[PDB]
């Protein structure tokens, strides 16, 4: 059966400014089947309050979901997105770079 | 508004 790998991007809703509230996002798209596991990390640990958009799909039938949580960035906290899907041998971890 | 007639493959 068909299996497509998720593309992953981690970023903030607004440009990051230390001390100002924002949302940390992890967008996963282009994948199939639809079961997928997405966690957001603060200094390596799983953030518990994380929500996601309702499952939808593109013209070519591939799925997409936005995972997101409120946060206030600092000079020193590190963030990341960790994803698991049938197409990945091990979970894939993407770090947040205030720049992409 | 949704289509209101059933369709089965």
């Amino acid at each position: 059966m068909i299996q497509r790998t998720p593309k992953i991007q981690v970023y903030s809703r607004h440009p990051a400014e230390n001390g100002k509230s924002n949302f940390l996002n992890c967008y996963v798209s282009g994948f199939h089947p639809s079961d997928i596991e997405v966690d957001l990390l603060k200094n390596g640990e799983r953030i518990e309050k994380v929500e996601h958009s309702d499952l939808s799909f593109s013209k070519d039938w591939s799925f997409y979901l936005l995972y997101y949580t409120e946060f206030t960035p600092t000079e020193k906290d590190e963030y990341a997105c960790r994803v698991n899907h049938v197409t990945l041998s091990q979970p894939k971890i993407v770090k947040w770079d205030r720049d992409m | 508004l949704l289509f209101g007639y059933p369709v089965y493959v």
Partner: protein
């Protein structure tokens, strides 16, 4: 300009673990307005945009009754297809369906759609003439023949040309502030040194709506397509979208590069330069 209405339905079987998961979502252009999730506690169609929250209970009860009817036909379909493909009862399988309509810039009916996919691949689709069907699989032939005999295309044509478009116009009018708006991209560039002799210039478009946008770099006015890294347009979470495009610039050459931005919200296309 032009507008569309689309409903997306996904049904996934869960052998042993109970009834299949069924998720439905509706969109007008790039704005989601309703959802139904078989696993959620309400068991009702629910609002996802501010302008639809005002339709009354007749609307919500009727869409909840029809969305549930769709859930059940997909439950039967998961069984019918396992049979057509002689597959095991133990595996998870997916059925997806999308249907909807497009109106042009005169808001008249332009095109209608009704199509299904099974496990990620095209299964059957209503043709553009809304009178005939495309089925690639031999397995899908049974569905096509059945639908022809039962004149299913005639019923859908009626809906796509009448009901579908009439209600898209109503939504466009009722949510004019959201839907008939345009949010122009806010742009900026970043400069970061890769080595002592190259640097990455990244062109950013943020906070724009609708999603369609064209972001490109040129060097001395020549398109740099093969040499531009472009990410997929992504949602900011607040109804707008974001995108960037980057190029690697040899030392001293920043003045040669221009980033070009086209988007319906801009009075004219932007030409930006790092300087």
């Amino acid at each position: 300009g032009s507008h569309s209405m689309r409903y997306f339905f996904t049904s996934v079987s869960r052998p042993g673990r109970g009834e299949p998961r069924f998720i439905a979502v509706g969109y007008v252009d790039d704005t989601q307005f309703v959802r139904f999730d078989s696993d959620a506690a309400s068991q009702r169609m629910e609002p996802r945009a501010p302008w639809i929250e005002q339709e009354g209970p007749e609307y919500w009860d009727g869409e909840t009754r029809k969305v549930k009817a769709h859930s059940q036909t997909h439950r039967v379909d998961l069984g019918t297809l396992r049979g057509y493909y002689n597959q095991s009862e133990a595996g998870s399988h997916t059925v997806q369906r999308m249907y909807g309509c497009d109106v042009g810039s005169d808001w008249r009916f332009l095109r209608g759609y009704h199509q299904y996919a099974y496990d990620g691949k095209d299964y059957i689709a209503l043709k553009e003439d809304l009178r005939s069907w495309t089925a690639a699989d031999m397995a899908a032939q049974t569905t096509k023949h059945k639908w022809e005999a039962a004149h299913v295309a005639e019923q859908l044509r009626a809906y796509l040309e009448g009901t579908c478009v009439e209600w898209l116009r109503r939504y466009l009018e009722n949510g004019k502030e959201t839907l008939q708006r345009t949010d122009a991209p806010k742009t900026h560039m970043t400069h970061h040194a890769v080595s002592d002799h190259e640097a990455t210039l990244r062109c950013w478009a943020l906070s724009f709506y609708p999603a369609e946008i064209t972001l490109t770099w040129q060097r001395d006015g020549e398109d740099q397509t093969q040499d531009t890294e472009l990410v997929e347009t992504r949602p900011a979470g607040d109804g707008t979208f974001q995108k960037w495009a980057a190029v690697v610039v040899p030392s001293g050459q920043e003045q040669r590069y221009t980033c070009h931005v086209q988007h319906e919200g801009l009075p004219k296309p932007l030409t930006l330069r790092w300087e």
